Design a protein around this ligand. Structure first.
Ligand SMILES: [Mg+2]
Ligand SMILES: [Mg+2]
Ligand SMILES: [Mg+2]
Ligand SMILES: [Mg+2]
Ligand SMILES: [Mg+2]
Ligand SMILES: [Mg+2]
Ligand SMILES: [Mg+2]
Ligand SMILES: [Mg+2]
Ligand SMILES: [Mg+2]
Ligand SMILES: [Mg+2]
Ligand SMILES: [Mg+2]
Ligand SMILES: [Mg+2]
Ligand SMILES: [Zn+2]
Lengths: 77, 140, 39, 103, 64, 193, 135, 136
RNA sequence: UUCCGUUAACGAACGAGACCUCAGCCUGCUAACUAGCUAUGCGGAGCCAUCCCUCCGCAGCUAGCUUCUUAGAGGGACUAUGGCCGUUUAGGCCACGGAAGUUUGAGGCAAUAACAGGUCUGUCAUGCCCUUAGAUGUUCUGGGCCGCACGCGCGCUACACUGAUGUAUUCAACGAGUAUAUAGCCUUGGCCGACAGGCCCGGGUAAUCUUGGGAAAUUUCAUCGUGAUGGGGAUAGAUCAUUGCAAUUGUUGGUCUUCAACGAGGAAUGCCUAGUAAGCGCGAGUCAUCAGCUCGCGUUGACUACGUCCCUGCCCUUUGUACACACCG
């Protein structure tokens, strides 16, 4: 995916990952990582490693940030 | 009357634990063992603790110091030093049958806690860059 | 401008420790200098 | 009147050297001086590696030459003339001694 | 439809192969413990090893 | 038995069951002496024959990541990758990822192979069996290389690549490099039977 | 204390501390330099002149008699010479010089006779307080 | 939020791409590299986490000013790439198209002069004292 | 060709082994203010603060200190112990113990006979020839050894996300340092400078000062997100300083810019069996400066095998030979 080049295109910053895509992407197992799903939602990284930051202040999922910036996902609890 | 100062060794890292009959405290170079800093090799440091348990440490303080070596060498030297320091403290100040349980808990999991590892970086011989390899060889 | 103390040639010198002798003269006289070859 | 003196003592051979070390320690302790030693000080390893060929043909073969220089130091508390009363005993070949007057 | 069958290596007879790389062993069958067959085995194999075995009625011959 | 020993303190070794009684001996997960907290150990292995058969299976999978030159010699990175893969396996299947590791190694070890025997004076390749230790060797190697190349020049990173290969090889689907190479070797050997 | 605090979070906390605990002078070349010859870009953080100072604070904390060259060496790194083999390369002098001069100007550290930089007692007070105020 | 997100900006006759960071899109100009892009971003005081495409018009004017008149920003003489000219003797940053012209002026001096280096270029082989048995 | 044993042989001489060096074990001995613990005495800072407790600083008639460091003497392993195989001989495989059970690991040294192997360019080592003043002698100047259509060899850097970049974090070993004149070889410390590098006080002929080597890889947090991109650093321009009596065919090192090929490499081929391969840095040699090399050193640290004579070769015996400059016959 062209997912940091596409960062400013208004679709992403308007509705795509604002619990419209990565609300259901976690739901396959009810927890499927953002870094795992970097390609299941084909969208690559850093338009994704920033939207994870957005979703953490949006308070919808838990976070696990570690060595190679391996970050994770959890849908609702 | 407790005071033991026992060491453990790796490639070149040497770890020395000097003790007091204290309360629970464990420090490496003044930094708590909690701040041992390979944070993936942070298990092996606690592992002699985690096998014996804090209950075998409510009466001891360990101002363990480590010099020379690398990183993982120093961590494994920690492991050996604290294991042998606990065994020696128990043997000389608790009971030999009491230390025998520590002996067996440690040795059942692994022998390398208590026995130094005689491996060293063996020297490099001419005719190559490397202690056992050679240069790539050309005929034509 | 610098040669062996021994043969007075201009290559293969051993400057270290101030010998001022070449690699050939040095071996030729090495055992009496005292460079016991333990290994 | 009773001053502090250093003796430093080096060599090439351990077997030769230790005989001198036992020599001076017993020389002092026959006359009850205040001595401390013989401090053993880490061995210098002089080394020169040379291509053992003289022309540079055949498989590259190096040989490693080494001297081992051994350093010993002893402190005595006595007057320097009392020191010269000791250090006129026989000194073994090859060993070097460099008595100096310190603080 | 062969059902993969099991054996234990009772002794390692030898080490055949052009490059000496196929152990030749003598296996005993678990499911009926009177069938003993000489087979070829590759890699490190010691006594008492259990081997899965896709096809059973092939056997090797001494110093194959 | 005595098993209050969890690797990384959080993935209980207990209640793991190996299907193959063949690989039961050579998988270091069952005995109370094979449990370890970390898949890093400065083990004096390979100093004797078969001594690696008692290496912890997680450690003996860890050593196989650190390959291809730029990665030779760094086990800290390897164990970091193992930790992340192991937690992501849990975060998908919510089941013992140790059992996932073991079951994958069971289900991706070639049981037959065609090598280069000569007999009667004439040499040509034929089918032979696979001793369980070499079963495990090829399983480890052949699961690992799939992750390596499937993550090469790929934004998906190695922890999730290897997690995908493990989950799917253990599940049994032929969507992993590992189990794809398995039946290829199996079919070459079956043809050459 | 600071030996009890995780070495990174103490640096973060002190970096914020020498921002909000008063202020000082600061050179007008900070947003230019690479802080080392082998580096390739200037630090990606804006208050790098402050995280640097937080680190160099605890260096004189836990070690004494450190000169400018000791910091040059400690803050060097790997220099990739291009097609040449890489080496070890010492860091820059002026950046560490002005960190030490800034900390001296707040009296946290000071130049010792016989040479080197040593902490002062009230700087010790400050570092221990900020260490204690960390989780 | 790219209501006017631009895919190529086209400053300085290079088609600077409007899809990568401004940090490393301004490097596409032939005469401004990785470091000098950063120093321009700093001195023109533009937000840093900003992909080209989202950026505003007044600040392309600011970049214009700071790239053709950098010195007035008290920037030292030693980011500049034409230190101590001998055509005239000033300190300037050459920009995209003019860099080839400046290089031709250099080599064209060398041609008129019969400098060893000028010939060596005209001859085509390596100019800096390098071997040429086995390379090139 | 190690031994048992057989035995027209007997008794021997080398090589092997034995020997020496390094490394690994010793809470056993000798000691060590040029090594380092340990305790107390004050100091500094955190604190139920008043003491205590944690971490640092400094000093001693502190040790009924030498575990860590050093280096001497020693001790230790012998297959010693047990099982199995073996003429129950020589030995082998296994197991407890133990630091060590491929002679424990690695080297040093290393036999007879030979090569038309290399070296007359290491040598006041050299025979014969040539030269020997208008010199192939010696000294100086400038150039050359580096030239480039190209082919080959040893290597370095990579082709990236197991990554690059930028912060934070902190761990060794081997060694090295001429009167080097008016402080001078390693350079600590203060200052100026973005850098490069300058100035001043000095320390060390050295377990004393450098360095108690504050090395990198790696670790941690962010930046780049698969794009020949922020991988790559080839090429080339501008300029700055040091070494040098001299920098041009850029000695070197900086600064900005220039941003190539290279998508893991055909036929083939090399090195390697445990702290080994490989990755990572340091020191030494060369040196006025130049280290991609060579020799040492440590750091992180594996997969595979414990085999076979299939390929290349080696040793013994038998056999065949029209070979002996010996199958390149
Ligand atoms: Mg990846
Ligand atoms: Mg030997
Ligand atoms: Mg000859
Ligand atoms: Mg001349
Ligand atoms: Mg040449
Ligand atoms: Mg070579
Ligand atoms: Mg780059
Ligand atoms: Mg050099
Ligand atoms: Mg050379
Ligand atoms: Mg070959
Ligand atoms: Mg004939
Ligand atoms: Mg023929
Ligand atoms: Zn000579």
């Amino acid at each position: 995916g062209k997912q940091k080049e596409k960062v400013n295109n208004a679709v992403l910053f308007d509705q795509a990952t604002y619990d419209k895509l990565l609300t259901e992407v976690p739901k396959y197992k009810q927890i499927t990582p953002s870094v795992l799903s970097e390609r299941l939602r084909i969208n690559g990284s850093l338009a994704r490693r920033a939207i994870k930051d957005l979703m953490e202040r949006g308070l919808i999922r838990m976070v696990s940030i570690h060595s190679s910036q391996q970050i994770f996902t959890r849908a609702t609890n | 009357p407790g005071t033991v100062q026992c060491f453990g060794r790796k490639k070149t890292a040497v770890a020395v634990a000097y003790c007091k009959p204290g309360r629970g405290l464990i420090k490496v170079n003044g930094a708590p063992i909690e701040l041992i800093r390979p944070e993936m090799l942070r298990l092996k440091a606690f592992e002699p603790i985690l096998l014996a348990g804090r209950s075998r440490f409510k009466d001891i303080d360990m101002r363990i110091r480590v010099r020379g070596g690398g990183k993982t060498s120093q961590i494994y030297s920690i492991r050996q030093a604290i294991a042998k320091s606990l065994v020696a403290y128990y043997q000389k100040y608790v009971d030999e049958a009491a230390k025998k349980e520590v002996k067996e808990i440690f040795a059942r999991y692994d022998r390398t806690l208590l026995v130094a590892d005689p491996r060293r970086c063996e020297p490099k011989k001419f005719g190559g860059r490397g202690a056992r390899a050679r240069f790539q060889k050309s005929y034509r | 401008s610098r040669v062996c103390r021994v043969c007075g040639n201009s290559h293969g010198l051993i400057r270290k420790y101030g010998l001022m002798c070449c690699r050939q003269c040095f071996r030729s006289n090495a055992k009496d200098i005292g460079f016991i070859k333990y290994r | 009147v009773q001053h502090r003196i250093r003796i430093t003592l080096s060599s090439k051979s351990v077997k030769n050297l230790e005989k001198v070390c036992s020599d001076l320690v017993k020389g002092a302790k026959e006359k009850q001086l205040k001595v401390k030693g013989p401090v053993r000080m880490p061995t210098k390893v002089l080394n020169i590696t040379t291509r053992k060929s003289p022309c540079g043909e055949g498989t590259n073969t190096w040989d490693r030459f080494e001297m081992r220089v051994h350093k010993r130091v002893i402190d005595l508390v006595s007057s320097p003339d009392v020191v010269k009363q000791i250090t006129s005993i026989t000194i073994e070949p090859g060993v070097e001694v460099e008595v100096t007057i310190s603080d | 439809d062969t059902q993969v069958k099991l054996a234990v290596v009772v002794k390692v007879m030898g080490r055949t192969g052009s490059r000496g790389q196929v152990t030749q062993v003598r296996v005993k069958f678990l499911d009926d413990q009177n069938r003993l067959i000489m087979r070829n085995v590759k890699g490190p194999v010691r006594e008492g090893d259990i081997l899965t075995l896709l096809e059973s009625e092939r056997e090797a011959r001494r110093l194959r | 038995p005595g098993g209050d020993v969890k690797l990384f303190n959080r993935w209980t070794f207990e209640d793991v069951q190996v299907s193959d009684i063949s690989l039961n001996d050579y998988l270091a997960v069952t005995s109370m002496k094979h449990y370890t907290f970390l898949p890093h150990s400065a083990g004096r292995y390979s100093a004797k024959r078969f001594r690696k058969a008692q290496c912890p299976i997680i450690e003996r999978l860890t050593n196989s990541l650190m390959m291809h030159g730029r990665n030779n010699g760094k086990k800290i990175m390897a164990v970091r990758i193992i930790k992340h893969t192991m937690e992501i396996i849990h975060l998908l299947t919510d089941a013992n990822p140790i059992q996932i590791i073991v079951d994958a190694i069971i289900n991706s070890g070639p049981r037959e192979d065609a090598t280069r025997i000569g007999s009667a004076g004439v040499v040509r390749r034929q089918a032979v069996d696979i001793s369980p230790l070499r079963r495990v060797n090829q399983a480890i190697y052949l699961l690992t290389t799939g992750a390596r190349e499937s993550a090469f020049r790929n934004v998906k990173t190695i922890a999730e690549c290897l997690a995908d290969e493990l989950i799917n090889a253990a599940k049994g689907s032929s969507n992993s490099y590992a189990i794809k190479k398995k039946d290829e070797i199996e079919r070459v050997a079956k043809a050459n039977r | 204390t600071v030996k009890d605090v995780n070495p990174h979070e103490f640096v973060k906390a002190y970096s914020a501390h020498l921002k909000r605990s008063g202020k000082m002078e600061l050179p007008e070349w900070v947003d230019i330099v690479k802080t080392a010859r082998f580096k390739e870009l200037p630090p990606s953080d804006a208050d790098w002149y402050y995280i640097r100072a937080a680190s160099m604070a605890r260096k004189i904390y836990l070690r004494q008699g450190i000169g400018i060259g000791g910091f040059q060496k400690i803050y060097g790194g790997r220099q990739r010479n291009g097609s040449r083999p890489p080496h070890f390369c010492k860091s820059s002098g002026a950046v560490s010089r002005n960190i030490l001069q800034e900390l001296q100007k707040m009296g946290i550290i000071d130049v010792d006779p016989k040479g080197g930089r040593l902490i002062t007692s009230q700087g010790r007070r400050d570092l221990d307080q900020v260490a204690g105020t960390v989780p | 939020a790219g209501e006017e997100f631009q895919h190529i900006l086209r400053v300085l006759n290079t088609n600077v791409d409007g899809k990568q960071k401004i940090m490393f899109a301004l490097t596409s100009i032939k005469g401004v590299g990785r470091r000098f892009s950063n120093i321009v971003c700093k001195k023109a005081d533009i937000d840093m986490n900003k992909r080209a495409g989202e950026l505003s018009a007044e600040e392309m004017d600011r970049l214009m000013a700071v790239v053709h008149n950098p010195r007035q920003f008290k920037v030292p003489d030693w980011f500049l790439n034409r230190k101590k000219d001998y055509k005239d003797g000033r300190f300037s940053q050459v920009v995209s198209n003019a860099v080839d012209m400046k290089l031709r002026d250099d080599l064209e001096r060398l041609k008129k002069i019969r400098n060893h280096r000028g010939l060596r270029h005209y001859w085509g082989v390596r100019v800096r004292g390098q071997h040429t048995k086995t390379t090139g």
